[PDB]
Design a protein around this ligand. Sequence first.
Ligand SMILES: Nc1ncnc2c1ncn2[C@@H]1O[C@H](COP(=O)(O)OP(=O)(O)OP(=O)(O)O)[C@@H](O)[C@H]1O
Ligand SMILES: Nc1ncnc2c1ncn2[C@@H]1O[C@H](COP(=O)(O)OP(=O)(O)O)[C@@H](O)[C@H]1O
Ligand SMILES: Nc1ncnc2c1ncn2[C@@H]1O[C@H](COP(=O)(O)OP(=O)(O)O)[C@@H](O)[C@H]1O
Ligand SMILES: [Mg+2]
Ligand SMILES: [Mg+2]
Lengths: 45, 242, 48, 49, 49, 48, 77
Amino acid sequence: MALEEFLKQIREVWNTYELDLVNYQNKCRLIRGWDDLFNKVKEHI
Amino acid sequence: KLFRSLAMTKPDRQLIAQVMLYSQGFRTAEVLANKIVPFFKLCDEQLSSQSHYDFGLRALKSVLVSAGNVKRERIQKIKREKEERGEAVDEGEIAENLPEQEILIQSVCETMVPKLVAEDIPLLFSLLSDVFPGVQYHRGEMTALREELKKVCQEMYLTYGDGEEVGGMWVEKVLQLYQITQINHGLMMVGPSGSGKSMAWRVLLKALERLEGVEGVAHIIDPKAISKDHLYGTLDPNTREW
Amino acid sequence: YLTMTQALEARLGGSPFGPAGTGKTESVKALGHQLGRFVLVFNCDETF
Amino acid sequence: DVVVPTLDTVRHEALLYTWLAEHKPLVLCGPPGSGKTMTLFSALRALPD
Amino acid sequence: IFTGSADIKHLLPVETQRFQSISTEFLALMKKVSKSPLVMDVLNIQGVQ
Amino acid sequence: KDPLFRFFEREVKMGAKLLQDVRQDLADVVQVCEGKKKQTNYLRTLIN
Amino acid sequence: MIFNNFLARLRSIPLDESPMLQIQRDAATIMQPYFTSNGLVTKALEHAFQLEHIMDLTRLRCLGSLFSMLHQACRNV
Ligand SMILES: Nc1ncnc2c1ncn2[C@@H]1O[C@H](COP(=O)(O)OP(=O)(O)OP(=O)(O)O)[C@@H](O)[C@H]1O
Ligand SMILES: Nc1ncnc2c1ncn2[C@@H]1O[C@H](COP(=O)(O)OP(=O)(O)O)[C@@H](O)[C@H]1O
Ligand SMILES: Nc1ncnc2c1ncn2[C@@H]1O[C@H](COP(=O)(O)OP(=O)(O)O)[C@@H](O)[C@H]1O
Ligand SMILES: [Mg+2]
Ligand SMILES: [Mg+2]
């Protein structure tokens, strides 16, 4: 029953995870939050 | 000098019309031929001269073949309507009570009208009245085909019409193209650039596909964008391969 | 038919000529079928 | 490369831009040396893609 | 460099042109990312990698 | 309904069209010979 | 018929592939009175056939160019 919980947790995390975009000199919407995204991907792997 | 030459210049159109209307079951074959051959001569010598006009033996043969087919269809329709409106069907009175002149005029108008320019149609109908008095041509309204055409036109942002409404002439041309497609296996659509030909045949193809349920496939070839060798094929001068 | 049969009897070919639409190919085919022959029609061009 | 701006030059610049913009085919007609290819090339530098 | 300094326009014209093309492509891809900030929508962009 | 009128209207239509063509061509030619207008490909062929 | 086809395509097909389509519908609503029989475009096209051109004048060449740069105007908006 634990493995299904992990699969559903991964599914919900990656169905609700969004890239963290911010404005950059009113030219673009650049992404921040690299460390947290990389850690999440690595820990889910 | 290895051949014997014969000049075939003037085919006997009147005799051909007489015999081939007699053999199809027309009782008035003599009068029908004597009316239809001079009518073709009158069409040749009275209408305006156009590069896409033909009133020769091929046109007469096609008209008479269509006349036979139309007579068969009318006899079948009469049998069906009499069977669904009582029981009095017999070959004799159906053959006797049959408008052969109207059938011939219908075939002439189904073959000759689509080729005519705008100003020649009144001339053609005046000639028809002169040679075939009292007979009128009433084209059946292909209602289901017209609804399919309207649906296709709406789907493709085309302007479908009817009668004298904007777009009525284009839909009339599409219906005439459909009739000629049924009659002939070789189609030519002549008209100045941007007159609606491509859209006419595309819309007709889609309408036929949606109506009859059989898929239509169109191959569009530019015969002059490539050499005739690439259009038809080459026989290898060395290996004799094709 | 008379001219083409005369050509056939002399072991000569038949060359009906005239303006298009006068019934030359069809006449030749009809004569060939009247004699029960296999008549092959070829549309010649410069590649023949 | 250098083009001296002119009334006709800028008008044809705008016309060539509004025609090449949607990738519509077009033809420049005029006597030889009129500046057809110069006008076209000076319109293509406004379209770096 | 390519926008703040106007002298690179004179000294590196072709470099500026290729960088401008790259910048337009990157901005288009970034706009596609921005309209759907969801990670998997970005991952499912056709030929993103 | 008059066949004669149909024949005559065809005749006058053809005649008027060809007359306008010929008169316009001659006017262009006489303008060219005076140097008023330059000579085109069609005008070159017509003059030759 | 050609004007109706142009207006229908303007109101239906977006130019990018919605703000674009809404701008298109508004522009079509503005252009509608001019794209009519005996309208400005029709009378101008009738008069254009009386002028001399470097090439033979065809109606659909003018109409296609006009529709092209009207789409460009929508893009500019
Ligand atoms: N029935 C119609 N309703 C609305 N628009 C139409 C209709 N028929 C054609 N058009 C439009 O008008 C133009 C005519 O193009 P079409 O392909 O019909 O011409 P065409 O006669 O085949 O031309 P060409 O021989 O020069 O290729 C096109 O832009 C087409 O979209
Ligand atoms: N004696 C005839 N009886 C019936 N049909 C004929 C006769 N002669 C010619 N035709 C018709 O004329 C049409 C054209 O004739 P065809 O032989 O193809 O002309 P061509 O001489 O140019 O080959 C054919 O469809 C044919 O049916
Ligand atoms: N407004 C202008 N500014 C600068 N040069 C011009 C201008 N108009 C014409 N020219 C000159 O005229 C010449 C036009 O030649 P070119 O454009 O090659 O002719 P074509 O377009 O017919 O091939 C160019 O060399 C250009 O220098
Ligand atoms: Mg076409
Ligand atoms: Mg033949």
